[PDB]
Design a protein around this ligand. Structure first.
Ligand SMILES: *[C@@H]1O[C@H](CO)[C@@H](O[C@@H]2O[C@H](CO)[C@@H](O[C@@H]3O[C@H](CO)[C@@H](O)[C@H](O)[C@H]3NC(C)=O)[C@H](O)[C@H]2NC(C)=O)[C@H](O)[C@H]1NC(C)=O
Ligand SMILES: Cc1ccc(S(=O)(=O)NC[C@H](C)N)cc1
Ligand SMILES: *[C@@H]1O[C@H](CO)[C@@H](O)[C@H](O)[C@H]1NC(C)=O
Ligand SMILES: [K+]
Ligand SMILES: [K+]
Length: 497
């Protein structure tokens, strides 16, 4: 293990500083023996996923807060956690020295870091690109003979993904998402602005667009990468807006329904990539449940859709029960998945706030909210950005859990990184969320899950300034006596019976 080297930039907490010779890291993961729990603690005062242990006790007394695990009340199974290998993240990572690159990738993908098992991969350029391109920019190439991957993929993204896979002991799953089509498929002939595919689902334009997804998967398969899933379009609502500033492709829900039913579903089903899952929406939750209703009540579309991808803009408020809750009630067998989340996108907010505990609390509170509303996974946006929150060709800068400073061959691990790791590190694929019942009203946020091997994990977030003593009861095993400090996050793990 190596501890955090903390540094303050004047915000409410610290970053951890890593460089060519040093980065904070855990020992190889082990469970305590039966009758012992593990606690990992991060605090605004500066502790960073520090490990301690304690006894699981037979007895409890107190009129104090009790959280009783409900191990047989089962909810959703968890796919996992990760982030996006955008052009911007790739450029930032590779701008570091080989040693620092490796320490950064270990931070995310190894068991000595926080055990990410998902990578989202843009299909060609987005806002977090320095060059606007698609994979088929030569016009009127409807059979896509000139489809090809540029160096952004072959030289930057693909090799980095291979390095992450090499470092991971968990199976890693890839998710692909497109922002724009070739401009010659679009009503407006530009990568951005208000514009959709030309024509109608079922026709030459739509069939070519669906063939583009298969060409993409074929091209990554030549580089020995297979995908778990694709989304039908990144933020399809964006392309319906005039002046939309960057790469987009507009679909109404009826348009996406018909595209999925007539072109994309059948094309993927008829390909070698038929096991790839298809996720709809890939957009903000206030589009739910309407979008789900429109697509999933058509059986020809419904039979191709595996899940609903949702985006989390953490700077903005939106209802969870009326969106995610209602969608789960209407469509309980269609999984919900968070495919993108980001903070600092407001123009008047500093894009990168080095050491912001508040932005850390936003990430963990959002993840907890997601897990409590049946969501099976959570995917961060850019894996790494520069101190400006870029590069970004339209200056749409945002924050990232890892900030690269090339001038110092240094990178900074944000509170966001630890808040997310409190989950990613300790919830393997196939974990199932279970119930957790509070004995009284309280200010804490918390979630409980059961590992595939039966082991318990509980995450507790305290967004208040007050230390809250509490007890966790596992009816089959005993009691954890603990405390949730003001401005802290804890993960608890123990073996059961
Ligand atoms: C990558 O980061 C490492 C950790 O910051 C650097 O290693 C540290 O270099 C420091 C300067 O030589 C060492 O001395 C301590 O520096 C601090 C201020 O940074 C002072 O307060 C201390 O007084 C001083 N030590 C003592 C005994 O007083 C650190 O000890 C050393 N840390 C470790 C863990 O080795 C690397 O130099 C840096 N690498 C590169 C390539 O830049
Ligand atoms: C959206 C949502 C998040 C967290 C929760 S909680 O963890 O149940 N805490 C609520 C209370 C503060 N004690 C419930 C709902
Ligand atoms: C728990 O409570 C029982 C009953 O009062 C007591 O006899 C015992 O010493 C305590 N501890 C254990 C480990 O059972
Ligand atoms: K090309
Ligand atoms: K900003």
């Amino acid at each position: 293990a190596r501890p955090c080297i903390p540094k303050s930039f004047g915000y409410s907490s610290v970053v951890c500083v890593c460089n060519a010779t040093y980065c904070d890291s855990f020992d190889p993961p082990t469970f305590p023996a039966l009758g012992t729990f593990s606690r990992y603690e991060s605090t605004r005062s500066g502790r960073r996923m520090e490990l301690s242990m304690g006894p699981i006790q037979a007895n409890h007394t107190g009129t104090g807060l009790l959280l009783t695990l409900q191990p047989e009340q089962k909810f959703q199974k968890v796919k996992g956690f990760g982030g996006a290998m955008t052009d911007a993240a790739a450029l930032n990572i590779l701008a570091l020295s080989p040693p620092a690159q490796n320490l950064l990738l270990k931070s995310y993908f190894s068991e000595e870091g926080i055990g990410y098992n998902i990578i989202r991969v843009p299909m060609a350029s987005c806002d977090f690109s320095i060059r606007t391109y698609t994979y088929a920019d030569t016009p009127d190439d409807f059979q896509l003979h000139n489809f090809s991957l540029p160096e952004e993929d072959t030289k930057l993204k693909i090799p980095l993904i291979h390095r992450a896979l090499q470092l991971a002991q968990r199976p890693v799953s890839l998710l692909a998402s497109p922002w724009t089509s070739p401009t010659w498929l679009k009503t407006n002939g530009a990568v951005n602005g208000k514009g959709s595919l030309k024509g109608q689902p079922g026709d030459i334009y739509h069939q070519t667009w669906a063939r583009y997804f298969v060409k993409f998967l074929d091209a990554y398969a030549e580089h020995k990468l297979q995908f778990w899933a694709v989304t039908a379009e990144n933020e399809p609502s964006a392309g319906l807006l005039s002046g939309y500033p960057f790469q987009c492709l507009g679909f109404t829900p009826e348009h996406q329904r018909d595209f999925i039913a007539r072109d994309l579903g059948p094309t993927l089903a008829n390909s070698t990539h038929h096991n790839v899952r298809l996720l709809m929406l890939d957009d903000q939750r206030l589009l739910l449940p309407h979008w789900a209703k429109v697509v999933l009540t058509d059986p020809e579309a419904a039979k191709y859709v595996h899940g609903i991808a949702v985006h989390w803009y953490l700077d903005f408020l939106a209802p969870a029960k009326a969106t995610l809750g209602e969608t789960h009630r209407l469509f309980p067998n269609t999984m919900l998945f968070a495919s993108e989340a980001c903070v600092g996108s407001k123009f008047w907010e500093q894009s990168v706030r080095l050491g912001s505990w508040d932005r850390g609390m936003q990430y963990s509170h959002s993840i907890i909210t997601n897990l409590l509303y049946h969501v099976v996974g959570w995917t961060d946006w850019n894996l790494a950005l520069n101190p400006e929150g870029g590069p970004n060709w339209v200056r749409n800068f945002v924050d990232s859990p890892i900030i690269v400073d090339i001038t110092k061959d240094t990178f900074y691990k944000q509170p966001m990184f630890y808040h997310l790791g409190h989950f990613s590190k300790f919830i393997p694929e196939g974990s199932q969320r279970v119930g957790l019942v509070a004995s009284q009203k309280n200010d804490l946020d918390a979630v409980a899950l059961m590992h595939p091997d039966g082991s318990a994990v509980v995450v507790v977030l305290n967004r208040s300034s007050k230390d809250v003593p509490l007890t966790i009861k596992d009816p089959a095993v005993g009691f954890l006596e603990t405390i949730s400090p003001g401005y802290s996050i804890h993960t608890y793990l123990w073996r059961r019976q």
